[PDB]
């Protein structure tokens, strides 16, 4: 119910030709396991100057029980949101 709101917000900013999401800012990847919501927020917390992810960031805050404010591979945010989007659609079995 509320997750599909998050999903379709991801889908909306993942749209074909718009400029790449948040210039070429890049964040730390995360394992799409458990605690993915809090992890996605903490990796997207330090993105600077990008209003296209603001609704996304506020929405994810409703999915993590605490206030936020593994580093193997750093990925473009456009690819980070694409990765998380496929994981969330899967949990919406």
């Amino acid at each position, epitope marked *: *119910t*509320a997750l599909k*709101e*998050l999903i379709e917000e991801l889908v909306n900013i993942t749209q074909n030709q718009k400029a790449p999401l948040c210039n070429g800012s890049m964040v730390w990847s995360i394992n799409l396991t458990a605690g993915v919501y809090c992890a996605a927020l903490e990796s997207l917390i330090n993105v600077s100057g990008c209003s296209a992810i*603001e609704k996304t960031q*506020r*929405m994810l*805050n*409703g*999915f*993590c*029980p*605490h*206030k936020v*404010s593994v580093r193997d591979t750093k990925i473009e945010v456009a690819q980070f949101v694409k990765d998380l989007l496929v994981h969330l659609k899967k949990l919406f079995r």
Partner: antibody
Amino acid sequence: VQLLESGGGLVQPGGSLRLSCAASGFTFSSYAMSWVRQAPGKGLEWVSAFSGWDVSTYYADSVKGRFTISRDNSKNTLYLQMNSLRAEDTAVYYCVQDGLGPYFYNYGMDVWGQGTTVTVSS
Amino acid sequence: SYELTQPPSVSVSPGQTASITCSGDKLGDKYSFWFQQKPGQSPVLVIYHDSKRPSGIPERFSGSNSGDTATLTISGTRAMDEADYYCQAWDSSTYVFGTGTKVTVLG
């Protein structure tokens, strides 16, 4: 996005009222919803909340056991059944678009309705 | 935390900076929210998640939350900014409001 409160009026102590709040302009069933009241000339006091993720409900200690928050997603309407009303319950009652997700409180409140007036006097 | 304390009154002249405080035990560990209520109308969200401005809110509004104090700053306060401002946070399964600050712009 609009929150249209209704059902206020004058009532004696011990009486009952049922407030309603017609919601529009947003997917109502996905967001938690809250009631916040303001006694004349005083500050804001949160009353109750109904989660948009659970059926869990939350209340301020001044109204627990007396107030019941409810919702109907098909009509996009929020309700507040107020029983055993007291004089200190006199206030303007606002219906507030609350948070998305299970931890809706970390999302926060957003839009507020214009409110209806409830006056409890013997 | 459970008791958010705000100074009752804040007064500035137009163009000056108005700083509104809101103190609470370990308030810096929670998300802080600020609500603006102009006389005769319902409150409007002006700051969420300590520092974010919602859509359509004037850019002179800014917020910070650190330690045990949340601060709302109005840079170059204008006449239309006269309002009651309210602090807010979540604690023990309840929403807790600050006692409120009346911001008077000496016009």
